[PDB]
Design a protein around this ligand. Sequence first.
Ligand SMILES: Nc1ncnc2c1ncn2[C@@H]1O[C@H](COP(=O)(O)O)[C@@H](O)[C@H]1O
Ligand SMILES: Nc1ncnc2c1ncn2[C@@H]1O[C@H](COP(=O)(O)O)[C@@H](O)[C@H]1O
Ligand SMILES: Nc1ncnc2c1ncn2[C@@H]1O[C@H](COP(=O)(O)O)[C@@H](O)[C@H]1O
Ligand SMILES: Nc1ncnc2c1ncn2[C@@H]1O[C@H](COP(=O)(O)O)[C@@H](O)[C@H]1O
Lengths: 473, 431, 435, 435
Amino acid sequence: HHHMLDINLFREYKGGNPEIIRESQRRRFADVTLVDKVIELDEVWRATIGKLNHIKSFTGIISKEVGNRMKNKVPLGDDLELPKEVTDDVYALFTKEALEQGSLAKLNTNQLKKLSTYITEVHIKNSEEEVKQKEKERDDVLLQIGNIVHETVVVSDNEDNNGIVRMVGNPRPKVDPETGYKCLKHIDIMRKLGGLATEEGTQVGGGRGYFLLGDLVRMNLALQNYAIDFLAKKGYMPIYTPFFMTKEQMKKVAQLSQFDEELYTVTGEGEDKYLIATSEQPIAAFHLEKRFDESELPIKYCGMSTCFRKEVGAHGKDTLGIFRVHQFEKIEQFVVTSPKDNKSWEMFDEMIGNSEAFYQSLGIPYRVVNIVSGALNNAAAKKFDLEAWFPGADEGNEYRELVSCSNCTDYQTRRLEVKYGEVEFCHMLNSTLTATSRTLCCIVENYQTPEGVNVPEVLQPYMGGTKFIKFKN
Amino acid sequence: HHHMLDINLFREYKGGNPEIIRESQRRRFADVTLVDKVIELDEVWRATIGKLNHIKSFTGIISKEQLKKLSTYITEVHIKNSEEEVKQKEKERDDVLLQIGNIVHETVVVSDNEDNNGIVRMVGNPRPKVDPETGYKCLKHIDIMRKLGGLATEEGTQVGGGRGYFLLGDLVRMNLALQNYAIDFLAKKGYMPIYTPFFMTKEQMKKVAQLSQFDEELYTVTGEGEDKYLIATSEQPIAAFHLEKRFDESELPIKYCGMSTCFRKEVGAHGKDTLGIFRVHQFEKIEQFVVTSPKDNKSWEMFDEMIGNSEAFYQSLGIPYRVVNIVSGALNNAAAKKFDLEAWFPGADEGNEYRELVSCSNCTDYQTRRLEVKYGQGSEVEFCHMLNSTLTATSRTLCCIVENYQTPEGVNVPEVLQPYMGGTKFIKFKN
Amino acid sequence: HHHMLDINLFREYKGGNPEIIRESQRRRFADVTLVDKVIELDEVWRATIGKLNHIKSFTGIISKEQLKKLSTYITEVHIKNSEEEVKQKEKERDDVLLQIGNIVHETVVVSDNEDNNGIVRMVGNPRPKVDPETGYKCLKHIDIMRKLGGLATEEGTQVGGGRGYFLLGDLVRMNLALQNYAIDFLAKKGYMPIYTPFFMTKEQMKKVAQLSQFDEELYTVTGEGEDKYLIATSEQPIAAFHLEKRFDESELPIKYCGMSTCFRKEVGAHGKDTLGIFRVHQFEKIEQFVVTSPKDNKSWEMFDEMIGNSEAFYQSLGIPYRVVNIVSGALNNAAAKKFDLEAWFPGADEGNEYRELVSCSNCTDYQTRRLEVKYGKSKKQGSEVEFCHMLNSTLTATSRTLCCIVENYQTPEGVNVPEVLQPYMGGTKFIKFKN
Amino acid sequence: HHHMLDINLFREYKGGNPEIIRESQRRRFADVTLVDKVIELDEVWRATIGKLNHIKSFTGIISKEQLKKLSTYITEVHIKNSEEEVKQKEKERDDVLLQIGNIVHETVVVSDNEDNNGIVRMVGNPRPKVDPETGYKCLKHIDIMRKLGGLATEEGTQVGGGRGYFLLGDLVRMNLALQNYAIDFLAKKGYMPIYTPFFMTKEQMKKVAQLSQFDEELYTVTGEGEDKYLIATSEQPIAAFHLEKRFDESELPIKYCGMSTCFRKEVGAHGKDTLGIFRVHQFEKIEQFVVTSPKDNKSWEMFDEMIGNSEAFYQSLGIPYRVVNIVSGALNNAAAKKFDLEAWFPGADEGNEYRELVSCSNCTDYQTRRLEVKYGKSKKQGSEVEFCHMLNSTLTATSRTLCCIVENYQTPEGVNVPEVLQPYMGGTKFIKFKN
Ligand SMILES: Nc1ncnc2c1ncn2[C@@H]1O[C@H](COP(=O)(O)O)[C@@H](O)[C@H]1O
Ligand SMILES: Nc1ncnc2c1ncn2[C@@H]1O[C@H](COP(=O)(O)O)[C@@H](O)[C@H]1O
Ligand SMILES: Nc1ncnc2c1ncn2[C@@H]1O[C@H](COP(=O)(O)O)[C@@H](O)[C@H]1O
Ligand SMILES: Nc1ncnc2c1ncn2[C@@H]1O[C@H](COP(=O)(O)O)[C@@H](O)[C@H]1O
């Protein structure tokens, strides 16, 4: 059983288990004290409701006394103001001892009706606002705690400890044992094909800018076309998205730190917008405030978009070619599931399995890696990456991520109000199928020859039968 | 013979013909007085150079003869003053010249009203708006796509702002099929596929776009490096790709099959074409882009080839259309001539059935001058010619396809696209 | 001999050695093709000058001898055109050259992974994380500072945004003691104190910062005059202080004790080091900054002297550390070599105990070229003048140093004040936990 | 008795006294009609509540007794509509009330012209501008600092923009001595040192600054998270530190020794004080900041104590000064009273010899209302709770104080170090002119 993060989990008196949240924070190497802060604020909130109900009882105590006086035909008295001693402290009049000793008998009936009005206007309203402030204060701390980390996640703060789950395929050696031919790197291969112009690309579009030319363009399309067919046949609905999102929409699907490191701003028509970093962002927002029955789940989407990333944190990293760029196309798996019966965890296995079958069909060797708990973002309960073999890489850098697959359970569906059926929420998952510029880098390295690049068998029909791309220089 | 716009054409005494430029300005319904301003500024410029040479000769007259202090004074006070003043008049002259539009080709219909666009030819068998044998009236593209379950404008606008959309299901696969087929179609005709940056730096965009496009058309993108613009068409980065390059006759023509998503603010078009994905802020477009020699009407022959390519494309899709000669008053400053292909939309409102799907333009050397795309003379060098033409903008082409291929039960897939969609022949209505 | 990066080094037939530049690019894991692009552009530039001078000969042959209009045409159409083409090719060559990083020093560990940073030496006696006799486990800096009542991250972030903090009470006094002691420490070594603008104009900042720093590191400040940047380190304005100056051998070296608040966006480090004041947007830093002669390996001797100063500083504080040789792939474009001092944090999570407190870099003439800090007031070499060298080294960044002190000097009852800081704290020897 | 500005004071029939508010507006030379506008809006607000409660009676009369749909209609169309109208009128009333300035204290000089600032007292023996025996004329601070070699406005403005400056050498050490001595001085009086964020979010800055400060005074800082403002004084973040807190009598007063760099656009002062570091965009300031009980004139006693602290500070430095009572028309909206300390500048132009070094203000509860700094943890008075009082007073802004020191301690050969600062300067007694 994997827990959802909600306020009840913090409440030891209501069947909750706050130590689970502390343990998740420790595995995230995050602020463990947030758990006790939420508990403290929740208790103050609940105590504040108790005070409000205590003040509200004063209303009934007054009206009952007024009612008894009217039945007994007691004169109302003059239109007197409340004594300063009463309004200095109305609480002192409503103790059991004070009432028995005749606290209200000191006031005529006109004064009792003024007192009730005063209590409503000055004390009940003040307490009602204080209840709202404390509720928001608690909820604001709760929003800072990350999703519960799944028990199968490797507990570590260093991705050197990412668990190697399995290895699939036959990675060609960097140096051919019979001819001594050393595998070239993707950028040299693509330039030797005449298919890549980083010089005009950066002149025209800024850093990391590129033009792709010729057969590499046709292979770029072939990958997209095949990926969409591949997922459509597995029941994933193809969906093409806006590449813009309004800022208020983006704030519902992304972490605030992504805004400075990752997201471009776009201005000039209507509200300022962000360019999307992944079709997962608009496809998530697509579900804003919707409700789904068990009979309507799961919902499977094959998302398609160009993706834009500022890569501010990665200056000086992967600066050669189109492995790490600001602009690339990506085919994405996106699934909404029931929150019941470990279905989202079963869907996680299905989605990483889809990506594995995809790269096996391409003849791309890879390994599946279990991402350490300290590196998960706040939404993910678990993340598997597929790291593919790059036989032209510099020593030690041969396995590089091509795919990430995450189960976010109900972390984002809560923020988007994607309800199931004290509401319950759906679960959401996402997984890369293929980001094509980096997959093209991997293909050209694994399929290179001394004369050019072989086209993977499964892509040949999607390229009009082209079997081979010959070096031009 | 079609004239290029350069400073020599303004100079009647040097073999030029400024009345050609005045007549071109009248056909554009533009500021005709700009021609006389260039002539006046050019004459003042030439006289200023003459005064400088007259001043510089004073140096030589002196040199033959404490007599050096006068000579230095002439250099420091007069020669420098005139040499800088020549630059001021030269930049001033060129600044007016840059405002004059390209010479309008003789075959362009001369008019200020696009109601007078010339209908060059009509090709195909457009289906009637209403089937005479059943009474079934063709639906509009937006209704067709929604009945297919393939279009979500509601979530699209919530997520992406005005005109935002999601496309779903078989329509997505048909969108890709159009792109995949278009690229194959042009690659087989010798057009090199090229995928471009969708960003351009502002200095680069200023070389390939008119200044008004920045306000009406181009989004700004910020956050990494210099502020940039989203491209409105792959023609913009592909043109910039040729910045300061030079080509021989043997290296021409250069033919590109450009591919990109395109982004347009459509500020001038609020309230126009507000239903569906006919006019949007974001769409994919396959573009023909060609650089030619400036000799022997080669660019005009390439113009005919390019509109012919688009015609063959829509014939292969079974899309009826007409070719339209855009009136001189509607040409932008770069274009010497523009043909549009307007396709039949049987679901359109009465009178609105033919709508632009393709524009095809010969800009001769107007943009290559600004980009320094030289042909092959010192400063008397010549420049190449550049042309561009839509092959297909896919969201609007999809609108046209579903209207022309609709039935009461769904949408037939055009025959030529079926292999590009895994063999799908028909898309059934879901609601 | 360590080479400076200039155009002459690219010209193999004219005494240069471009393979040295190619090997530096490989060690940086950077774009090697830039070297050949500069060579090609320089050759076209030199050929364009050759064509221009040959056209200029037409004047002497013709003008010495009514074909006089031809001479004007040749000047107006060909000579002017060639002159403009030379200026364009020179700028094109120089723009690519500016993209190549400084020549990496031969003693730098060659690697793309900082796991291979060379451990040069270790100094001190690091206390165990767990007391061997009592089992008391060293607390982390943030918990210590909160138990002292001296750190308010809650009000800090509400008032100042992410990573914002207030410091209160004796922790403030210790923060100040670090700054005052550091400034005295460097003054005794001949480093002149200098207080700088914390704003810099874009034109000047562009000469001392690479383009990636504008997105990852530098805040923009607006509202008076032109938009400006907050400094990330006093190294930036102190370097710019030397703009367009020339220094003779007798006027070097120039040693400055830089002091400022420093401002850093830390965009690349979202989610990293989020607890306490180890990594913040705002901190004070006492900085060693030196201008040296370019002769006789003087800047390399100064590099050793500057890391030695920082080492003696942390020895005097009783802070154990190690000196680390930063791998070539991690150096920024300006640095020819960088040593870090990584101090012991006994409260850190397992495996994270040694963390950077100091960086020390020799940038030789990479920045002085851009700032035109020339060597020699004489112009005898014309445009072949040499430039001074510049170095910088942290002495102490005080919020992170404070974190290190409180972890290393903690007891179960509070924090001992390091002996050398006690006179700077009115004799306070100990700060007691309040909760 | 000094009144707080709250809605009850506007209600003449309910124990208030609106003429007191009108007279405060007249003394401020501000908009008197705001008082009657608040009165009118409050009356309409109270009448709207009366109509709403009367409509609510329809439920009890009707609902107690198939005309049941009428009750729903009355609730859906009239009661909800009246409830919204009450909230709107309350906000409309409160928005006008926020525009009225704090009640001006009775001891404030009533005038619109600061020429009438009251001279409260003068302390010290100001040296003559011209030496009576030698005729030596006192130099101005900028010339002194340049002759010491300690001030670089040329590099300062090139690097940092207008008014930018570097300080070098012993002037830096004296700048630092002022800060360290000031912090020790206030610590002995029980003021806790506090170091603050120099950034503030817009939501918090709006609670401690009036709208005109955003255009004239506050820089905007952008690039990480939301746009923020640079602080103009540590008073701003230290006030915000108390957001939504409640303090009992036993927890007051709260005394802070604020320290920060301060940033000011000085847009209103272009062309004013353009020579040297008397008026700059960036300076360090040691600040007295106090929260007091609202009872028994305690904040007015604290005001006297705070100006007294500043006076003893400048007496210890041997700086002659005068205390000035700032005219009512010049007070900002928050201040009920403001005293300035104006020090003697013997190098100033004729007539400009006394210039502000210190401002000391009692803001009573003007800001604590906006920050919800409540008095008493008990809620026995509900929404009729009282707020604490807040005061602030400069101890020393060091660049301007340095200007005053060098003019007052100059000789023909250099500058004497004030006796009390000598231990803070390693015993340096004198700084000699270098040129
Ligand atoms: N800057 C980039 N350039 C190219 N491909 C990228 C980039 N960032 C991510 N990708 C690809 O997209 C996948 C998903 O990335 P992420 O959403 O960061 O998990 C990666 O595994 C890569 O294949
Ligand atoms: N805002 C738009 N939305 C969709 N398609 C467009 C839009 N603007 C232009 N197009 C398509 O792109 C082609 C070229 O347009 P233009 O570049 O204006 O000549 C048109 O004929 C349309 O097919
Ligand atoms: N964001 C930061 N917060 C606190 N201290 C920092 C930060 N960045 C750098 N430092 C300190 O400043 C020193 C020099 O940093 P750098 O200029 O990056 O080499 C480091 O060794 C740290 O001690
Ligand atoms: N622009 C400035 N430059 C230097 N010192 C200043 C500046 N503005 C204010 N000060 C100092 O700070 C004190 C308090 O200023 P204020 O907060 O305006 O009352 C003044 O008395 C001056 O000593």
